[PDB]
Symmetry: C2
Subunit: 71 residues, 2 copies
């Protein structure tokens, strides 16, 4: 084959290997971002469930106070 | 100036493979990105709810304060 053809084939083989490496890196990183945000969201869901519990415990305190007033 | 058919067939193949890799990559990134914006959206929701419920809580504390004062005896 001609020398100019071999160089172009070689160059494209490189760019394809380079590109497959870029895909692996960009995917790894976007999964890493994904795991950070889904954990952030889990912590938020937990803050809300803890707040719901504090709220539910005050409902019961309210009841005990009503029992003292309305008894 | 000519090149071989086999060579051209091989350059074109690689050029196609390279553009497809770029395509595959763009659309996997796009699917991540749309799933992340969908998630940052549920986090916006969850936070508005939290603030809403914090308000219920703050109002229960005021009611508790008022019952403690109302029941309070002298001396």
């Amino acid at each position: 084959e001609s020398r100019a053809c071999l160089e172009r084939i070689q160059e494209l083989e490189d760019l394809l290997a380079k590109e497959k490496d870029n895909s692996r890196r960009m995917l790894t990183d976007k999964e890493r971002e994904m795991a950070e945000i889904r954990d952030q969201m889990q912590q938020q869901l937990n803050d809300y469930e803890q707040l719901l519990d504090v709220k539910l415990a005050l409902d019961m305190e309210i009841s005990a106070y009503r029992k003292l007033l309305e008894g």
